[PDB]
Design a protein around this ligand. Structure first.
Ligand SMILES: *[C@@H]1O[C@H](CO)[C@@H](O[C@@H]2O[C@H](CO)[C@@H](O[C@@H]3O[C@H](CO[C@H]4O[C@H](CO[C@H]5O[C@H](CO)[C@@H](O)[C@H](O)[C@@H]5O)[C@@H](O)[C@H](O[C@H]5O[C@H](CO)[C@@H](O)[C@H](O)[C@@H]5O)[C@@H]4O)[C@@H](O)[C@H](O[C@H]4O[C@H](CO[C@H]5O[C@H](CO)[C@@H](O)[C@H](O)[C@@H]5O)[C@@H](O)[C@H](O)[C@@H]4O[C@H]4O[C@H](CO)[C@@H](O)[C@H](O)[C@@H]4O[C@H]4O[C@H](CO)[C@@H](O)[C@H](O)[C@@H]4O)[C@@H]3O)[C@H](O)[C@H]2NC(C)=O)[C@H](O)[C@H]1NC(C)=O
Ligand SMILES: CC(=O)N[C@H]1[C@H](O[C@H]2[C@H](O)[C@H](O)[C@H](O[C@H]3[C@H](O)[C@@H](CO)O[C@@H](O[C@H]4[C@H](O)[C@H](O)[C@H](O[C@H]5[C@H](O)[C@@H](CO)O[C@@H](O[C@H]6[C@H](O)[C@H](O)[C@H](O[C@H]7[C@H](O)[C@@H](CO)O[C@@H](O[C@H]8[C@H](O)[C@H](O)[C@H](O[C@H]9[C@H](O)[C@H](O)[C@H](O)O[C@@H]9CO)O[C@@H]8CO)[C@@H]7NC(C)=O)O[C@@H]6CO)[C@@H]5NC(C)=O)O[C@@H]4COP(=O)(O)O)[C@@H]3NC(C)=O)O[C@@H]2CO)O[C@H](CO)[C@@H](O)[C@@H]1O
Ligand SMILES: *[C@@H]1O[C@H](CO)[C@@H](O[C@@H]2O[C@H](CO)[C@@H](O[C@@H]3O[C@H](CO[C@H]4O[C@H](CO)[C@@H](O)[C@H](O[C@H]5O[C@H](CO)[C@@H](O)[C@H](O)[C@@H]5O)[C@@H]4O)[C@@H](O)[C@H](O[C@H]4O[C@H](CO)[C@@H](O)[C@H](O)[C@@H]4O[C@H]4O[C@H](CO)[C@@H](O)[C@H](O)[C@@H]4O)[C@@H]3O)[C@H](O)[C@H]2NC(C)=O)[C@H](O)[C@H]1NC(C)=O
Ligand SMILES: *[C@@H]1O[C@H](CO)[C@@H](O[C@@H]2O[C@H](CO)[C@@H](O[C@@H]3O[C@H](CO)[C@@H](O)[C@H](O[C@H]4O[C@H](CO)[C@@H](O)[C@H](O)[C@@H]4O[C@H]4O[C@H](CO)[C@@H](O)[C@H](O)[C@@H]4O)[C@@H]3O)[C@H](O)[C@H]2NC(C)=O)[C@H](O)[C@H]1NC(C)=O
Ligand SMILES: *[C@@H]1O[C@H](CO)[C@@H](O[C@@H]2O[C@H](CO)[C@@H](O)[C@H](O)[C@H]2NC(C)=O)[C@H](O)[C@H]1NC(C)=O
Ligand SMILES: *[C@@H]1O[C@H](CO)[C@@H](O[C@@H]2O[C@H](CO)[C@@H](O)[C@H](O)[C@H]2NC(C)=O)[C@H](O)[C@H]1NC(C)=O
Ligand SMILES: *[C@@H]1O[C@H](CO)[C@@H](O)[C@H](O)[C@H]1NC(C)=O
Ligand SMILES: OC[C@H]1O[C@@H](O)[C@H](O)[C@@H](O)[C@H]1O
Length: 957
């Protein structure tokens, strides 16, 4: 099943053009950042981690909202994404579904799948047909960008965590029919060998699996439960698919968070820099060669794209935050590790062995997994045997090296593993022809700078280390004091011992310079490739790795290029930053930073030295309470003057849903009528008979939904909402009705997205939204005839620019008043801070200017006070819905919105719906716009995507 000659493989790793590669990869979802001109930003930050690969989903639900009309342009265009990857020199793994899970509405499935007469994710002909147009279009786009045409796409994942075997095979043939030629890779939810090579029909080319050892309950970030760290993955691999290279297609890099959850902060505090350093070195101990972190950039579930088991934010506690910042320590810690892999090709050939206790150390409190292959060059991964230990452990190593079984340290001192940490010790490590016999401190990187070799080593604080070099030369200390450093010669080797310190030492041994850093100073180093024509580094290759330089900076280094005699750095800064360039080429004479000539200095050792001053600019943000807010009633349906005669009639005698038969005379399932997204409104018309006393109603909006009911203009009550309840049972009492008169029951229902469909055969995505059942006491159910609406036009959705999910069924949304320049001068003055005095729903509108300085990346947030009322709000920024706030469920109160969506030197239109589900009415406790550290950026101009303004819609009601 090999079908091209560019990407091949053996049992050890992939090859790209006959050369081994370790794919260190990050998950990014373009649809979760609707600003195409910011995608390159994400790639820069991932390449700067030392990654060479990105993994991404395509969301069917946003691309074919209307059946038969595939649409992937503007903010949903796939091409600028592929271009950005190419520009940053990042390979892509494409995971198009058609089912993607991803914590998005429907797990990727459009709402109209609720009308399809076949089992989802099965070889049922109607379901296969339903996916045909989507895959023929999406996979075609992926095909043009394959590496066989010089694009970045090197692999393709069919489906997602699957389990007929027939179904899998079909999805593969379906992609092959669209010219996908690259190898197929799988993502088994657990390591069970599902669909591995040899499993019959549906077998992929390369077996891959997932793992999230700590799960997703972020409630107790400091606690790592016993026995959760996997230790058998390399054994399982050899049993399940030894012919293909070991592959982790999703490994934990954060966690998702449900409505009513602890928040992504605690999620980060659980999956922090200790998690990464311990767990990721653990994955290297299995000899993983394709290794993707889910998520490495989370983004935002803007425009209702998310599923009910999650809220607006998808920060995920990821290495790169929702606001795209790289402050988290996990980021800097991942960078140390990825740079070691990038610099260490012998890692791929160093065959993994069973883990050991008490063999390579005296203690059994440590576990050691050796990586030893057919040729010299080995690695020993060390961690506490109980991975959760906070203990600080002292130990000595007995390692087998080319100079014999050595006991280390050979000179003074002891090694330390302090708490939740892990080390990769190297033996017979080749630095360009110089053999490092061993080194206990970890490798960051090494380069040959044509004549002189540089090796960068680091350890954590208060640690002692040693290394040995096969060398005849003497040992000189060319920077720092010899305080704490001892050396001696033993035959044809040179042994060096040292204490970790916050001040760098550099030691020279012949033509080899060894940098000795502490972990926290190594955090500030970068290893960018140095292209000599153009500013793009190109894809990752051993030749491009070989001609990289070492740079000490601060917040971020995007890249570097050599323009004749000018050395260019492209960087971001969040503080005054000392810069150092190590390994500048001999022709280089001048330093440029972000296109500006910068003064520099050369020391006795030929290291370049410069500085960039940081001075926070003044940031003027309007106070939101001071704005000229306009109020509009966006539930005019609960006034007796409203005419619903244009509404669709809910009069289907049979549902097309195969998963939940009706309990009502007609279908009140919203997807039967093409409404899948946003708030839903139902209207039940009946003639009274004077015998009515109670009205019972079961509503369903997905977990954490609310609903409110009126009889004519009289409020009956609300299902207030909770995190566990996907549905709600409500009984309301009725004082006597006027026999013979018309009455209308109005029901408003929050829809928080459609379910995923994780278990094949269970059909949970077909869980309907709307009214499940009802009983009007003293009346026959068929006496009530219903109208309903969701978003105007249903599947004939109005906003092509913002996609089929962005706007819901509120009156203001049906008219398009959430868009720029609403017709609001005629509206009443009213702030959401004053709010409503009775149940109902208000719509609030205002505009403000921003005038933020060019050259600065500044995260902006909408902040909501929490007064704990049962109130629901939707935020819109220039037409884009960027927040669902619910005061009695939580936890989100701060809502970031990216530049592009916000206009930083122009006008912005904010809109806000406020729904009161309590009889006293409701208000916002506070509503402030805030910011966090302004970053001096070397990124270019951020272009806004289309922000279509308000315009009168044909047939709005
Ligand atoms: C502004 O501030 C205000 C005030 O501070 C904030 O409001 C508060 O928000 C929180 C969070 O939303 C609210 O707490 C939640 O309330 C839920 C609902 O409570 C009611 O419903 C259930 C009924 O279900 C049972 O019974 C029915 C029939 O009656 C059955 O059909 C059903 O199946 C069940 O058997 C009742 O259990 C509950 O009863 C209590 O109250 C009554 C009356 O007081 C008593 O008589 C009862 O005896 C009992 O005391 C009540 O009727 C509730 O479901 C939910 O519970 C979950 O979380 C609890 C602990 O949460 C704390 O710690 C969390 C971290 O763990 C924090 O995130 C959280 O904020 C809080 O501090 C657990 O005890 C409970 O077992 C549930 O755990 C699940 O969720 C946790 C959090 O995600 C997870 O850690 C757990 O692992 C677990 O997760 C699993 O299940 C969930 C679904 O539940 C899945 O999502 C998940 O993936 C996984 O499968 C919680 O208690 C609180 O009510 C509210 N306070 C007020 C005053 O309104 C507001 O949020 C804030 N706003 C903003 C914008 O920030
Ligand atoms: C040399 C130097 O200086 N070096 C220095 C260096 O600089 C760097 C720097 O950092 C840069 O980042 C740079 O990176 C570059 C990179 O080099 C290049 C690689 O070549 O790529 C760069 O970015 C490019 C992007 O990749 C794209 O290619 C982009 O292309 C876009 C074009 O630019 C743009 C021009 O306008 O057009 C876009 O396409 C849009 C169209 O414009 C169009 O109008 C579309 O509008 C649509 C609308 O989207 C949809 C919404 O769905 O609706 C459509 O109409 C609908 C409508 O809704 C109807 O209802 C209808 O419905 C009908 C239906 O049709 C049917 O008939 C039925 O019967 O009835 C229905 C009724 O319901 O449907 C219609 C359907 O049409 C609209 N259509 C219409 C007609 O109205 O939207 C399109 C969006 O898709 C292009 N995009 C695409 C995808 O095509 O160009 C980018 C380049 O921009 P730039 O030149 O300005 O920069 C990349 N740049 C970036 C930002 O990454 O690298 C350089 C290296 O030089 O920096 C160094 C380091 O510091 C420094 O040192 C160095 O010196
Ligand atoms: C400009 O950008 C730069 C990045 O380029 C930003 O710099 C980063 O800023 C973040 C904070 O936003 C730093 O992360 C934090 O650092 C705290 C610890 O200090 C670290 O450095 C000191 C030396 O100065 C070391 O001694 C520490 O190492 C030791 O401790 C750690 C953690 O305990 C151990 O794992 C090590 O083994 C060492 O023993 C650190 O390296 C740190 O406290 C903080 O971490 C806490 O909070 C996170 C979650 O928020 C938890 O995951 C973690 O467990 C910590 O929580 C501890 O304390 C809490 C109380 O809150 C307890 O409840 C817990 O049990 C636990 O004990 C966090 O990691 C980051 O290092 C830094 N990066 C760099 C490269 O400088 C700037 O912020 C930015 N500037 C501006 C203006 O924006
Ligand atoms: C990198 O990205 C991450 C993730 O995107 C960023 O982390 C988020 O940062 C935001 C903003 O700081 C943060 O939201 C705040 O959390 C604080 C702690 O819980 C809150 O104190 C704070 O709310 C108060 O302050 C706001 C102004 O700062 C007010 O507008 C708001 O009303 C709140 O009011 C406070 O003060 C008043 C009176 O003073 C009082 O009445 C209140 O009770 C309260 O004391 C914000 O909500 C998020 O928690 C973070 N989100 C996540 C997922 O992490 C990070 O900032 C970025 N780093 C950089 C450097 O940019
Ligand atoms: C309850 O509300 C409805 C409107 O939703 C009222 O319906 C009106 O009733 C009169 C008399 O039958 C009709 O001529 C109007 O055409 C109706 N309006 C609409 C838009 O249908 C009804 O009267 C209200 N009932 C009570 C008892 O107040
Ligand atoms: C609303 O009421 C229905 C029952 O009318 C509840 O659904 C039942 O739940 C039990 C146990 O969870 C199941 O075994 C039954 O099969 C269900 N009955 C039916 C007819 O669906 C539902 O849990 C209630 N909703 C809430 C939020 O309490
Ligand atoms: C081999 O590794 C397993 C975990 O996979 C471990 O429990 C066992 O003790 C190891 N065997 C040896 C060589 O000690
Ligand atoms: O964030 C949790 C993740 O779980 C994975 O197993 C799944 O493959 C992803 O689609 C996502 O749901």
């Amino acid at each position: 099943d090999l079908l091209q000659d560019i990407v091949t493989w053996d049992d050890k790793s992939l090859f790209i053009n006959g050369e081994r590669i370790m794919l260190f990869s990050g998950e990014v979802h373009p649809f979760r950042l609707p600003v195409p001109s910011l995608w390159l930003d994400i790639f820069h930050k991932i390449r700067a981690l030392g990654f060479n690969c990105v993994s991404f989903y395509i969301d069917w639900a946003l691309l074919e909202g209307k059946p038969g009309d595939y649409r992937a342009e503007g903010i949903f265009a796939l091409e600028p994404f592929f271009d950005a990857a190419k520009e940053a020199g990042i390979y892509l793994i494409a995971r198009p579904g058609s089912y993607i899970n991803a914590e998005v509405s429907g797990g990727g499935f459009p709402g109209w799948l609720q009308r399809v007469n076949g089992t989802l994710r099965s070889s049922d002909e109607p379901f296969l047909k339903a996916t045909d147009n989507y895959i023929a279009n999406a996979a075609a786009a992926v095909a043009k960008a394959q590496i066989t045409n010089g694009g970045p796409v090197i692999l393709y994942q069919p489906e997602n965590e699957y389990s007929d075997a027939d179904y899998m095979q079909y999805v593969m043939d379906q992609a092959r029919k669209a010219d996908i030629v690259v190898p197929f890779i799988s993502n088994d939810a657990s390591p069970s060998g599902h669909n591995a090579p040899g499993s019959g029909t549906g077998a992929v080319d390369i077996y891959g699996h997932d793992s999230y050892p700590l799960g997703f309950d972020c409630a107790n970030p400091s606690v790592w439960p016993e026995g959760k760290l996997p230790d058998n993955f390399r054994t399982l691999h050899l049993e399940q698919s030894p012919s293909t290279p070991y592959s982790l297609l999703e490994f934990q890099a954060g966690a998702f968070d449900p409505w009513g959850g602890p928040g992504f902060e605690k999620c980060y505090a659980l999956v922090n820099h200790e998690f990464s350093r311990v767990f990721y070195r653990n994955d290297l101990s299995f000899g993983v060669s394709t290794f993707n972190l889910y998520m490495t950039f989370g983004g935002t579930n803007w425009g209702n794209l998310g599923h009910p088991g999650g809220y607006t934010s998808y920060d995920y506690g990821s290495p790169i935050t929702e606001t795209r910042n790289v402050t988290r320590e996990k980021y800097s810690d991942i960078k140390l590790l990825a740079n070691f892999v990038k610099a260490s090709p012998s890692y791929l050939t160093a065959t993994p062995r069973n883990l050991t206790t008490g063999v390579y150390t005296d203690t059994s409190d440590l576990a050691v997994t050796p990586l030893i292959g057919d040729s010299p060059g080995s690695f020993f991964v060390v961690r506490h045997t109980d991975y959760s230990s906070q203990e600080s452990t002292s130990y000595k190593l007995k390692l087998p090296t080319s100079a014999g079984n050595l006991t280390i340290p050979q000179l003074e001192g002891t090694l330390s593993l302090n708490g939740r940490d892990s080390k990769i010790h190297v033996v017979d490590y080749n630095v360009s022809g110089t053999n490092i016999i061993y080194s206990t401190a970890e490798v960051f990187t090494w380069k040959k700078f044509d004549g002189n070799k540089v090796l960068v080593l680091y350890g954590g604080p208060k640690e002692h280390h040693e290394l040995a070099i096969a060398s005849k030369s003497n040992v000189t200390i060319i920077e720092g004091s010899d305080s704490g450093i001892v050396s001696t010669r033993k035959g044809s080797s040179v042994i060096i011992g040292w204490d970790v310190s916050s001040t760098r030492r550099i030691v020279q041994v012949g033509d080899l310079r060894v940098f000795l850093l502490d972990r926290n100073s190594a955090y500030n180093y970068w290893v960018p490739e140095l292209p000599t024509e153009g500013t793009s580094p190109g894809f990752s290759t051993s030749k491009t790795t070989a001609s990289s330089i070492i740079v000490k900076a601060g917040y971020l280094l995007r890249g570097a290029h050599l323009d004749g005699a000018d050395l260019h750095l492209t960087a971001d800064f969040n503080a005054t930053t000392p810069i150092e360039v190590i390994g500048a080429p001999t022709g280089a004479k001048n330093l440029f930073v972000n296109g500006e000539k910068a003064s520099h200095t050369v020391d006795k050792n030929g290291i370049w030295s410069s500085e960039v001053k940081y001075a926070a600019p003044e940031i003027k943000l309007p106070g939101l309470k001071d704005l000229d807010w306009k109020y509009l009633d966006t539930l005019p349906e609960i006034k007796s003057s409203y005419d619903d005669s244009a509404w669709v009639s809910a009069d289907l005698p049979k549902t097309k849903n195969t998963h939940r038969p009706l309990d009502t005379p007609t279908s009140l399932y919203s997807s039967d009528y093409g409404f899948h997204t946003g708030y839903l409104i139902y209207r039940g018309h009946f003639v009274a008979n004077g015998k009515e006393s109670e009205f019972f109603i079961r509503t369903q909006g997905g977990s954490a939904f609310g609903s409110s009911v009126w009889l004519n203009e009289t409020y009956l009550g609300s299902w207030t909402g909770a995190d566990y309840a996907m549905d709600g049972n409500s009984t309301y009492k009725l004082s006597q009705l006027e026999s013979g008169k018309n009455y209308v029951i109005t029901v408003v229902i929050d829809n928080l997205g459609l379910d995923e469909n994780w278990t094949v055969g269970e059909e949970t995505m077909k869980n309907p939204r709307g009214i499940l059942s009802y009983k009007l006491s003293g009346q026959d159910a068929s006496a009530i005839t219903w109208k309903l609406t969701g978003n105007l036009g249903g599947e004939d959705y109005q906003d092509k620019v913002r996609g089929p999910l962005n706007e819901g069924g509120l009156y203001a949304e049906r008219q398009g008043f959430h868009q720029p320049q609403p017709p609001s001068e005629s509206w009443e003055s009213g702030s959401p801070l004053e709010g409503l005095s009775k149940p109902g729903i208000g719509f609030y509108t205002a505009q403000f200017d921003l005038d933020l300085p060019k050259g600065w990346d500044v995260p902006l947030y909408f902040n909501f006070g929490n007064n704990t009322q049962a109130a629901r709000a939707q935020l819109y920024v220039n037409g884009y819905q960027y927040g669902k706030f619910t005061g009695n469920v939580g936890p989100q109160t701060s809502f970031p919105v990216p530049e592009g969506i916000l206009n930083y030197r122009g006008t912005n239109y904010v809109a806000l719906s406020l729904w009161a589900l309590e009889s006293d009415g409701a208000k916002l406790g506070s509503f402030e716009l805030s910011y966090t550290t302004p970053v001096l950026t070397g990124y270019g101009n951020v272009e806004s995507p289309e922000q279509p303004k308000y315009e009168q819609r044909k047939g709005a009601y």
